[PDB]
Amino acid sequence: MLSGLNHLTLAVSQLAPSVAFYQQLLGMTLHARWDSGAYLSCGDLWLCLSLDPQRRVTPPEESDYTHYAFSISEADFASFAARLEAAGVAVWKLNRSEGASHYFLDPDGHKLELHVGSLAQRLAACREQPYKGMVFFE
């Protein structure tokens, strides 16, 4: 069977500002970089940044809801979100429609998120406050 995300590859227009964002600002571990990409890790996540001349910025209102959420503890969530805000990182969504989340953009307009909680916790919360028409499968 398939089991797990092996890696997430993000196309980037400029490699150095992207590496700086993920390593310096988000605190991910940089393992290697080369003329056309970089490999970082975030816990078990393998992140590849790939220099792509085809990557364009799109303002968030003109891209779809595809997005990438990173786990953070309840104790660190608010202060890290506030640090991103204070550093001028743009926000793309304010309404918390899926629990405790902060929604921010990377330098290339990729839609990112900080989230507190697992899938099991989300399902348990949704049993009490379900999305419209929600059905649960055991």
Could you give the CA distance from residue 33 to residue 119 in angstroms, rounded to a whole number? 33
* b/e burial code for range 63-89 (CB count within 10 A of at least 16 → b): eeeebeebebeeeebeebbeebeeeeb
Residues 6+ apart with CB under 8 A from 7: 45, 46, 47, 48
Q: How many residues bind Zn ion (CB under 5 A)?
A: 3
Residue 61 phi, psi (nearest 5): -70, -15
Looking at the DSSP bridge assignments, the partners of residue 47 are 8, 40
Q: Which of residues 26-65 bind a second copy (CB under 8 A)?
A: 26-28, 30-37, 39, 41-46, 48, 50, 52, 54-56, 62-65
125 binding a second copy? (CB under 8 A): no
What's the chain's length in residues?
A: 138
136 binds, among Zn ion, a second copy, none (CB under 5 to 8 A by kind): a second copy
* Residue 69 makes contact with Zn ion by CB under 5 A: yes
**What, of Zn ion, a second copy, none, does residue 100 touch, CB below 5 to 8 Å by kind?**
none
Determine, following the binding rule CB under 8 A, whether residue 113 of this chain makes contact with a second copy: yes
Interface residues toward a second copy, by CB under 8 A: 1-11, 26-28, 30-37, 39, 41-46, 48, 50, 52, 54-56, 62-73, 76, 80, 98, 110, 113-115, 117-119, 122-123, 126, 130-137
Chain residues binding Zn ion by CB under 5 A are 9, 69, 113
